Amino acid sequence: MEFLKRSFAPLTEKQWQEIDNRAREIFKTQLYGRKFVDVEGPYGWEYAAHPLGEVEVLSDENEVVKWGLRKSLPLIELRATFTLDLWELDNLERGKPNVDLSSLEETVRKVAEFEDEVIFRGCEKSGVKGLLSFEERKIECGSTPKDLLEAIVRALSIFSKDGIEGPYTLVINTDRWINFLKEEAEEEPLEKRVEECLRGGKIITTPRIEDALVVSERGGDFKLILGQDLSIGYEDREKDAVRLFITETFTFQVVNPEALILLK
Amino acid sequence: MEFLKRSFAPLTEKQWQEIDNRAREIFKTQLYGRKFVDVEGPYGWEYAAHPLGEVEVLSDENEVVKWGLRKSLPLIELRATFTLDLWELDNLERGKPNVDLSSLEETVRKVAEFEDEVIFRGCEKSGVKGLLSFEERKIECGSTPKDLLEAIVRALSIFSKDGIEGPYTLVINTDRWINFLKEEAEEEPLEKRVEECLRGGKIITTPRIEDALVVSERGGDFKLILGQDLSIGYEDREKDAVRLFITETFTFQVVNPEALILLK
Amino acid sequence: MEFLKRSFAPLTEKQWQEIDNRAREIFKTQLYGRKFVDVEGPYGWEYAAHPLGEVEVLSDENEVVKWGLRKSLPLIELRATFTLDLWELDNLERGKPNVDLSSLEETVRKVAEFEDEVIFRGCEKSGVKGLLSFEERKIECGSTPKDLLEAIVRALSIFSKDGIEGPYTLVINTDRWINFLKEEAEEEPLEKRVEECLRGGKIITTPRIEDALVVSERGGDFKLILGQDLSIGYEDREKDAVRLFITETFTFQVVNPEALILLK
Numbered sequence: 001m002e003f004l005k006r007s008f009a010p011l012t013e014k015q016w017q018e019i020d021n022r023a024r025e026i027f028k029t030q031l032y033g034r035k036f037v038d039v040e041g042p043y044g045w046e047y048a049a050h051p052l053g054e055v056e057v058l059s060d061e062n063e064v065v066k067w068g069l070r071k072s073l074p075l076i077e078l079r080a081t082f083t084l085d086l087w088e089l090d091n092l093e094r095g096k097p098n099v100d101l102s103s104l105e106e107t108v109r110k111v112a113e114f115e116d117e118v119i120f121r122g123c124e125k126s127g128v129k130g131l132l133s134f135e136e137r138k139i140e141c142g143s144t145p146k147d148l149l150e151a152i153v154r155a156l157s158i159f160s161k162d163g164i165e166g167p168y169t170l171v172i173n174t175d176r177w178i179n180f181l182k183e184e185a186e187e188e189p190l191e192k193r194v195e196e197c198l199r200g201g202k203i204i205t206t207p208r209i210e211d212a213l214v215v216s217e218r219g220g221d222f223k224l225i226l227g228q229d230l231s232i233g234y235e236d237r238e239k240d241a242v243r244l245f246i247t248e249t250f251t252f253q254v255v256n257p258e259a260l261i262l263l264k
Numbered sequence: 265m266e267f268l269k270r271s272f273a274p275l276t277e278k279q280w281q282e283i284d285n286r287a288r289e290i291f292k293t294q295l296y297g298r299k300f301v302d303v304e305g306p307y308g309w310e311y312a313a314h315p316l317g318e319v320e321v322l323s324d325e326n327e328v329v330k331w332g333l334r335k336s337l338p339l340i341e342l343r344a345t346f347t348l349d350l351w352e353l354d355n356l357e358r359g360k361p362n363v364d365l366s367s368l369e370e371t372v373r374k375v376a377e378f379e380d381e382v383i384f385r386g387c388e389k390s391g392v393k394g395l396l397s398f399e400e401r402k403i404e405c406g407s408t409p410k411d412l413l414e415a416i417v418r419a420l421s422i423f424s425k426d427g428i429e430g431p432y433t434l435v436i437n438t439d440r441w442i443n444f445l446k447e448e449a450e451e452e453p454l455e456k457r458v459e460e461c462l463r464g465g466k467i468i469t470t471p472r473i474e475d476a477l478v479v480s481e482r483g484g485d486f487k488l489i490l491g492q493d494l495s496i497g498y499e500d501r502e503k504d505a506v507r508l509f510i511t512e513t514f515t516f517q518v519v520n521p522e523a524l525i526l527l528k
Numbered sequence: 529m530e531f532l533k534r535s536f537a538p539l540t541e542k543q544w545q546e547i548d549n550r551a552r553e554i555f556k557t558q559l560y561g562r563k564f565v566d567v568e569g570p571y572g573w574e575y576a577a578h579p580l581g582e583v584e585v586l587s588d589e590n591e592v593v594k595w596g597l598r599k600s601l602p603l604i605e606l607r608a609t610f611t612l613d614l615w616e617l618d619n620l621e622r623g624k625p626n627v628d629l630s631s632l633e634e635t636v637r638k639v640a641e642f643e644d645e646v647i648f649r650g651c652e653k654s655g656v657k658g659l660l661s662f663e664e665r666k667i668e669c670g671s672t673p674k675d676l677l678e679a680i681v682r683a684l685s686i687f688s689k690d691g692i693e694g695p696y697t698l699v700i701n702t703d704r705w706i707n708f709l710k711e712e713a714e715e716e717p718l719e720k721r722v723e724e725c726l727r728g729g730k731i732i733t734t735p736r737i738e739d740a741l742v743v744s745e746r747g748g749d750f751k752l753i754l755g756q757d758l759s760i761g762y763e764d765r766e767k768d769a770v771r772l773f774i775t776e777t778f779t780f781q782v783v784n785p786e787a788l789i790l791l792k
């Protein structure tokens with residue numbers, strides 16, 4: 001990846017390695033949608049559009065020759081910059097085991113939020129439709145713990161009326177999960193009963209949404225298309241510090257809307 | 265270890281062996297912090313200081329040549345003495361299976377308390393900071409059994425917002441644990457639910473502290489540095505008895521303060 | 529030595545080589561104490577302290593457990609900077625045999641003076657004691673040439689009363705040596721008689737001190753401890769020039785005060 005001008009910065013190999021590790025650790029836990037969507041492999045730094053498979057007609061009816069144009073989806077590219085101090089970084093050679101890296105962490109969290117927003121709610125300038133837009137698959141629920149089990153039992157019938165099958169997963173909000181744990185008039189652990197009502201599924205808690213949803217996980221319904229993964233490069237020097245950046249290129253699509261149900 | 269003048273005392277091999285075994289047994293159960301800290305290997309009887317990796321400037325701004333001094337941590341050495349009676353020790357050769365060794369046991373307990381005090385609360389003359397000093401990672405709790413589960417669930421989110429992961433452990437006071445067992449309005453064993461709320465963690469009870477704390481156990485955050493381990497040597501003879509001693513050399517350090525949380 | 533960022537400066541190999549040679553030449557003649565002290569080998573860029581071998585007690589007398597701290601000496605680190613012009617340096621490629629390098633020479637002389645000052649007179653903030661501090665080994669002398677021979681003959685007896693032996697060396701001030709040469713009422717070369725009064729010793733003249741001293745040279749009494757030797761590195765660029773620096777890390781110690789005598 002020579003377009004990242006890494007050999008022109010005044011650092012050493014050990015000073016690059018720790019910067020890589022610290023960012024990898026946080027990304028792994030803070031990316032949420034990659035826990036249950038599919039990923040299509042990288043194409044390269046030159047890929048530009050993804051085809052849809054249709055034609056739009058632009059001529060009259062009395063013509064002898066008729067014509068139209070093909071359709072596609074364009075990709076999104078992003079960039080974000082930060083700065084670091086040099087004397088502090090140079091204590092690693094004298095033997096300090098812990099150095100200060102707060103700006104990197106704040107920038108990483110901002111990028112993760114931006115990425116999750118598009119998957120959950122979509123983008124209008126690009127023509128992307130998000131998971132919460134499909135408003136004809138919503139069913140009601142209740143407050144007491146048994147209403148959750150009743151709702152799950154009712155949802156599996158709607159799943160089975162079509163041909164949909166496979167492992168099932170629940171995605172829920174953390175405050176509501178805490179309230180469900182707090183309010184237990186019946187004496188039985190909630191997690192065991194919930195995991196048994198699904199045929200051995202699993203539960204994911206997150207602060208991104210407000211209510212709950214249920215999805216199927218056989219494979220092939222939600223896809224994320226990548227051109228280049230997340231990377232770090234070099235920009236310039238500011239007489240006491242250095243300036244660096246983060247970048248990426250992607251798009252998203254939903255194929256079969258039959259594998260998703262919304263609660264409340 | 266020739267600096268321990270063991271060959272000049274009037275004893276036999278069997279009389280040395282039982283003295284070693286009795287002390288090993290008690291140390292194993294009474295040292296508490298070694299259950300969850302890391303240990304860096306021995307360096308020797310001549311090691312004196314551990315480096316930190318910084319410079320302190322001591323000159324003016326208009327100088328042509330500028331200079332400073334490096335920084336480090338000094339080690340601690342201790343010694344404690346006791347006495348034993350000779351006719352009583354000589355019945356082992358006639359065939360007695362149980363002899364009287366109470367002074368050794370009392371001294372061992374005193375040494376163990378001194379060692380744990382520095383880890384939990386620090387030393388000021390040497391420049392050591394202890395686990396209870398970090399006062400910006402404390403959260404509130406309650407009296408009823410369900411408040412404990414709520415607090416644990418809230419703590420794991422703070423852990424996951426950073427990159428911290430791994431097995432988790434709870435350290436609690438024994439009287440409070442007994443009260444929690446006694447007050448069970450809900451009908452379910454507390455230990456199973458507590459061990460399941462953590463993803464398969466464990467619980468440690470101790471009389472050293474007053475409240476509870478939660479720690480991560482991936483490895484590399486709390487370290488104890490040793491020069492020489494615990495040993496026994498010979499001093500002199502007092503016309504009816506013998507005099508012996510115990511000694512050691514050590515220091516302690518905390519690297520990443522992100523893996524620790526304090527309750528109440 | 530990657531902590532010296534030499535690969536990021538805009539120079540060539542020939543332009544580095546001559547800069548190295550010119551500094552080596554001057555250091556060799558201008559470092560004076562290395563002519564008669566001992567040198568302990570390099571340890572590295574991370575070494576921080578040198579042990580002394582003692583304990584200081586900090587507890588009371590009625591305690592059951594007693595403790596103290598170990599002792600050591602900290603190292604000294606220095607840094608000094610200068611600047612050079614680029615068009616002038618570029619004539620070496622066209623074929624000029626002599627280029628202008630005056631700033632480097634002035635800086636080198638300043639560093640040499642700073643180094644010799646600590647050996648001859650010590651430093652108070654660090655706890656170093658210098659050769660002229662030991663004030664109980666001083667004997668009187670005279671002005672005429674024969675008084676020097678009388679003083680040397682008297683000094684060798686004090687040396688032999690202890691067990692000290694080996695080659696002997698004289699260190700003297702240059703103006704006083706010139707006056708001794710000028711005032712020769714007796715007709716015999718002074719150097720031959722002086723070198724014969726010692727059992728084949730040698731003479732060193734220097735502008736650092738005021739009076740003379742006599743030392744033994746069997747080996748093992750005065751030691752200089754080094755972490756990193758003298759080196760050159762790169763800092764930045766100033767739109768017409770480049771900026772560079774010099775650095776080092778050391779300490780000094782006197783072991784046996786019986787091998788030294790002071791005159792007048």
Ligand SMILES: Cc1cc2nc3c(=O)[nH]c(=O)nc-3n(C[C@H](O)[C@H](O)[C@H](O)CO)c2cc1C
Pocket residue numbers: 086087090319321330331332605606607609
């Ligand atoms: C003893 C000393 C050591 C220094 N070490 C470094 C260093 O490792 N990295 C750095 O960027 N600046 C360092 N500086 C600051 C840098 O040299 C400063 O900008 C001027 O060059 C000091 O004259 C150091 C300054 C001093 C006095």
Ligand SMILES: Cc1cc2nc3c(=O)[nH]c(=O)nc-3n(C[C@H](O)[C@H](O)[C@H](O)CO)c2cc1C
Pocket residue numbers: 350351354
């Ligand atoms: C029968 C007898 C056996 C003894 N055995 C021992 C012994 O094994 N070890 C010991 O320290 N003293 C022993 N003593 C005490 C010791 O001998 C005492 O100080 C005097 O030497 C007794 O005259 C013994 C005394 C007696 C009378």
Ligand SMILES: Cc1cc2nc3c(=O)[nH]c(=O)nc-3n(C[C@H](O)[C@H](O)[C@H](O)CO)c2cc1C
Pocket residue numbers: 614615618
């Ligand atoms: C004929 C000529 C040769 C030059 N050669 C050099 C050179 O070798 N190194 C340098 O630093 N500047 C050199 N300069 C100066 C440098 O080019 C100047 O800053 C401007 O670029 C001149 O337009 C040269 C200028 C001239 C006119």
